Amino acid sequence: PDFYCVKWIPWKGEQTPIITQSTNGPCPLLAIMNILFLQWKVKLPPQKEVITSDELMAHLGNCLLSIKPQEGLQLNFQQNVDDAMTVLPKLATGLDVNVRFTGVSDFEYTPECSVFDLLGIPLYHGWLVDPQSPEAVRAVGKLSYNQLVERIITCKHSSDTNLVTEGLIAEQFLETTAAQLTYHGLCELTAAAKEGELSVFFRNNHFSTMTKHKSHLYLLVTDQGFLQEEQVVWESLHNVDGDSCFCDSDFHLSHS
Ligand SMILES: [Hg+2]
């Protein structure tokens, strides 16, 4: 959380910085910031090696406050900026994220969602309930995750056996989809993402910087272990869980 290592890479033919972490924390700061660095919206002095949160925060503050309104939600805009600013300091420490299983862009709104929306950064997750299993669909339905854990507990202590049944139908779905990415999710997520756009991907209380390229998904390699490995930049998100290929800045294969 204190200091982060900067990694310089040849992004779109220009030396561009990227921020690394070994810690694997639940801070979306780096996910958001790396997107901004990749879009050249923040620039660092060429020599830079290490960076603090307070700099990144500063850079982010300026970035949000420098957004000119450009066509739609008017009184919302000004509240969203104020919402973004009030929650801005939380982005360093960590964040509760309550997904919904109804679609890849679906969360319970908290004001931290304003920062993504202001900056035009999509937030996605892959924890989707399958249409194929329609008992789980019925049991989960409208509910978000933290609502589903409440209802599961409520369903245990019900005397009605219908509810107690569904309380297990749902408790199954979380047990079977424990790694928070279903195959149905990965398909829907791929189709959803705009080719060559940067976005943030949520899974197991981690935020990753994501993009789509030749209609395949890749995540940025935040890992500090590959700090020296300039040729290791993107990692494929082709399978639901397992083996994955690494790529350089231009999406060509690479090895260590
Ligand atoms: Hg959020």
27, 63, 155, 247: which is the annotated catalytic residue?
27
Same domain? For 122 and 90 the reply is yes
Same domain? For 29 and 99 the reply is yes
Domain presence at residue 236: yes
Same domain? For 84 and 203 the reply is yes
How much distance in Å is there from the Cα of 45 to the middle of ligand 1?
31
Annotated catalytic residue 213:
no
Same domain? For 78 and 166 the reply is no
DSSP string, 82-111: HHHHHHTTHHHH-----BBSS-TT-B---T
Question: Helices marked H in 132-196 — which ranges?
Answer: 134-140, 145-156, 161-176, 183-192
Same domain? For 35 and 149 the reply is no
Domain presence at residue 94: yes
Same domain? For 185 and 64 the reply is yes
Same domain? For 88 and 19 the reply is yes
**In the chain, how many domains are there?**
2
Backbone φ/ψ region at 224: left (φ over 0), alpha (ψ -120 to 50), beta: alpha
How much distance in Å is there from the Cα of 165 to the middle of ligand 1?
31
SS (HEC) of 28-59: CHHHHHHHHHHCCCCCCCCCCCEEEHHHHHHH
Annotated catalytic residue 206:
yes
How much distance in Å is there from the Cα of 67 to the middle of ligand 1?
20
Q: How far is CA 133 from CA 76, 139, 165, in A?
A: 38, 10, 16
Domain presence at residue 10: yes
Residues 201, 189: Cα–Cα separation, whole Å:
10
Domain presence at residue 254: no
Q: At what angle do helices 29-38 and 53-65 cross, to 10 degrees?
A: 60
Same domain? For 162 and 84 the reply is no
3-class secondary-structure state, position 127: coil
Q: Which of 36, 95, 25, 94 is nearest to 61 (CA)?
A: 36
How much distance in Å is there from the Cα of 28 to the middle of ligand 1?
9
Q: How far is CA 147 from CA 55, 142, 179, 231, in A?
A: 36, 10, 19, 43
Q: Which run of H or of E encompasses 209?
A: strand 206-213
Domain presence at residue 252: no
Same domain? For 112 and 147 the reply is no
Domain coverage including residue 149: 134-176
**Resolution of the solved structure (Å):** 3.0
Domain presence at residue 214: yes
Domain presence at residue 256: no
- Token couple for 89: 């300091």
206, 213, 216, 238: which is the annotated catalytic residue?
206
Residue list, CB under 5 A from ion ligand 1 = 112-113
How much distance in Å is there from the Cα of 98 to the middle of ligand 1?
8
How much distance in Å is there from the Cα of 196 to the middle of ligand 1?
22
Q: Residues before each break in the chain (C–N > 2.5 Å)?
A: 71
Same domain? For 14 and 141 the reply is no
Domain presence at residue 88: yes
Same domain? For 168 and 46 the reply is no
Same domain? For 169 and 111 the reply is no
